[PDB]
Amino acid sequence: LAIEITTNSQEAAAKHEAQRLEQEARGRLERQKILDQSEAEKARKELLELE
Amino acid sequence: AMSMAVESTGNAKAEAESRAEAARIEGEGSVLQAKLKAQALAIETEAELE
């Protein structure tokens, strides 16, 4: 149990880091999705002018 | 919001200006028919006057 509370401790920290990276990656994916949709709306402005 | 504004104003102005152009053509047509019918009445009633 003395080493078990170490393997669990290091994998829990690895799990916490993975969640931090996953949320950061998802956080930047949300940045890119909104920005790309903003550019799409920019182009849709002239598209709708022409329409 | 800008895209929706331009799209909605274009869609409204199209359906409004088509109606306006059709009404202008109908007005010109109506005044020309008014002239032609005025001549028709002014000659029909003139002959019927005799």
- DSSP codes joined into one string, A1-51: -TTHHHHHHHHHHHHHHHHHHHHHHHHHHHHHHHHHHHHHHHHHHHHHHH-
Method: cryo-EM
Resolution (A): 3.8
Dmax (CA) of chain A: 72
| Distance to chain A for B42, nearest Cα, Å | 50
CB contact under 8 A, A44 and B3: yes
**Is the sign of the CA dihedral A15, A18, A22, A28 positive or negative?**
positive
Of A41, A44, A48, which is closest to B10 when you measure between CB atoms? A48
B7, with CB counted inside 10 A (0-12, 13-18, 19+), is middle
**Looking at chain B, which residue has its C-alpha nearest residue A43?**
B3
Chain A residues touching B7 at Cβ < 8 A: 48, 51
